[PDB]
Amino acid sequence: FCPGPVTLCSDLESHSTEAVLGDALVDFSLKLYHAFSAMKKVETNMAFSPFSIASLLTQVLLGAGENTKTNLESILSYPKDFTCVHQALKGFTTKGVTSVSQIFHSPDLAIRDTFVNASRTLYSSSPRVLSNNSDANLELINTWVAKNTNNKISRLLDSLPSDTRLVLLNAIYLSAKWKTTFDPKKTRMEPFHFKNSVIKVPMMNSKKYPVAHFIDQTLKAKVGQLQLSHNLSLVILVPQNLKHRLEDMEQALSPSVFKAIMEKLEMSKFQPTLLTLPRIKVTTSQDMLSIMEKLEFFDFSYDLNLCGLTEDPDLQVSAMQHQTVLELTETGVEAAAASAISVARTLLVFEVQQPFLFVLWDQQHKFPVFMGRVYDPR
Question: How far is Cα 322 from Cα 324, in angstroms, rounded to an integer?
């Protein structure tokens, strides 16, 4: 027994589910954030895409039965009978990233016909078959990923198991950039508070950068939003004083707090601000089967039901890999506006000079495209 293929939703029904999906992706983002943080060493930079990971998992969900279906739904925070999710996900795609997801399988694993067309339609690729030797396959996968990421991700995999039957892959990079360009002639070495010490890093600077910002009292953090191209923004969360550790802020960032931060920002206006921050440059490669286990999802390596994908009775995911590349330097779409001098006696300020958490936020559909943290900008 296996659930028959999911039925397509009308356009109207699919638009109604955007808000549900937005809510789930926020929930899911936080579960990932803590699991990513639990896998990594204590004071490290990281960046991941809840959206593109969710999309990959949802494409797997498309082929799941039994407990795996329920277990995936829980992880993803989807309610039962969320059948339009596969179309809504496709509608949320942002052109400010290039994301590539793919399922690769051995030749001895037969993919069902009903999964092939559903997959292509809804996720823009049907599963791809691997070769009969594994050296060939590594290079097949890495070349495919390079090809499809305009060479930003050229080594998604270092190795593969020798008995590889099913591989799940997502690679993603940010192509959007700052709506307002930073003047590279102003970038300056400034202090950044890291460990108990002060280090100097290059900081992008403006005296009047449009920033929407406030102070959140539950987080004890300054919250600032910078506008990007493609209806995306970067939201930066920095603990107020050096008194506060990023760790404590991480704990306090619940889904309600997170949501509230986002609803507040949609209503906060962008204002001329004295702004200082490092260049943000983070690449993270993560074995996602360890993350799925941290999230207490075990099905990929034990008792898997992907009956919709394949009839094969002895199935496990041999590898699941995610890579984000996220880079924001001075380059922006538009030149800074001008003002005549000071006029102002009081100027707004937002300076990023200690470890911080970030969310790259989709303003149109209200979800996190990326999330992560920077401890050391070098």
Answer: 7
Name residue 166's amino acid: L
Residue 84 structural domain = 1-378
**Backbone torsion region of residue 46, taken as left when φ is above 0, otherwise alpha when ψ lies between -120 and 50, otherwise beta:** beta
Reduced 3-state DSSP string for 304-328:
CCCCCCCCCCCCCCCEEEEEEEEEE
At residue 123, the 3 state secondary structure works out as: helix
| CA pair distance 18, 362, nearest whole angstrom | 12
> Angle at Cα 376 formed by Cα 370 and Cα 378, nearest 5°?
100
**All residues at 6 or more sequence positions from 364 whose CB lies less than 8 Å from its CB, including other chains:** 231
Q: How far is CA 1 from CA 83, 112, 305, 306, 307, in A?
A: 19, 14, 11, 11, 8
Residues in CB range of 345: below 8 A, 6 or more apart: none
Distances (CA, A) of 22 to 95, 116, 227: 18, 27, 20
Cα-based angle 224, 227, 230 (whole degrees, multiple of 5): 145
The CA distance from 208 to 211, in Å, is 9
Tokens of 344: 């102002």
What is the tally of structural domains in the chain?
1
Tokens 């309600």 correspond to 256
Q: How many CA atoms lie within 13 A of 362 on its CB side?
A: 27
| Separation CA 190–CA 16 (nearest Å) | 47
Return the closest-CA partner of residue 204 out of 187, 227, 190, 185.
187
Is the CB of residue 161 less than 8 Å from the CB of residue 319?
A: yes
